[PDB]
Amino acid sequence: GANPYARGPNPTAASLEASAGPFTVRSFTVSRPSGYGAGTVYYPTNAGGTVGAIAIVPGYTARQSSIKWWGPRLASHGFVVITIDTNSTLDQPESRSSQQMAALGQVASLNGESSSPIYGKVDTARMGVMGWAMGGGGSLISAANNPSLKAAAPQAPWHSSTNFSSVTVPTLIFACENDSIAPVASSALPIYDSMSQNAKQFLEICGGSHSCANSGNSNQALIGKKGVAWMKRFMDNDTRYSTFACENPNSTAVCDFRTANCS
Ligand SMILES: O=C(O)c1ccc(C(=O)OCCO)cc1
Hints:
Elements: H1 13-17, E1 25-29, E2 38-44, E3 51-57, H2 70-75, E4 80-85, H3 93-111, E5 122-131, H4 134-145, E6 151-152, E7 171-176, H5 188-194, E8 200-205, H6 220-235, H7 242-246, E9 254-260
Parallel strand pairs: 3-4, 3-5, 5-6, 7-8
Antiparallel strand pairs: 1-2, 2-4, 8-9
Helix pairs in contact: 3-4
Bound molecules: 4-(2-hydroxyethyloxycarbonyl)benzoic acid (C9C).
4-(2-hydroxyethyloxycarbonyl)benzoic acid binds at residues 59-60, 133-134, 158, 181-182.
């Protein structure tokens, strides 16, 4: 009968483009990070059922600030989101992946901790990964190594190998047209093209620098719509979001759009 994971009101373009989703969001600092540097957990206070968890990792030299906007944006639509700082700002993608997954493990821990604000708020069987640049590469390594993850949505990803043919997790790649750090033609697009087994999508922002999907970007309506739609469709199996997840948004800000195996 009903989808047990469906949360919130039926979506519209306006409701997904808005700065905030329907749920009230609170946050806390992780007291003793388990296998990573630091974290902030964002959660809905009024979701009305358990929700999936998403761990988000920054790029080389970067901190939570670069990725923080995703925390309230996703949590307000019905997700527990952990943004992390890595053990070193100079960690590489394999270490970033390990830390991302340690952060998901700690969110699953806190779901069982009676003192935690997220006590009983998480469905530990439904998880996703996001991250910027080397943290985006780390997200793809997380997905390759943990195929029970339900979704991945890295931004401006880089890894030393572009071969993610092993990934079976639904994966949305945000790319930045004018990226001079991890050029689209040598990084994000080859990564996208390597993936053969999954639902996948590629969304490149016109004129974007390497930071085009970071906190303070000028395309939060489109990027936030797509990220939330992808996570709802695939983490919650929520087919109310099938068209938002799969469509070409046919937007003036999009300079390359590709999708395959989307439903
Ligand atoms: O995480 C990053 O921001 C980061 C991403 C990519 C690189 C790198 O040198 O790629 C070489 C291809 O241009 C370095 C740092």
